[PDB]
């Protein structure tokens with residue numbers, strides 16, 4: 001997620017989805 005842009009791209013998903021990689 002890049003509304004909640006931890007990384008602004010598409011991988012390290014901190015926030016909302018909690019899919020695998022984070023912060």
Ligand SMILES: [Cu+2]
Nearest residue numbers: 001002012013
């Ligand atoms: Cu994200």
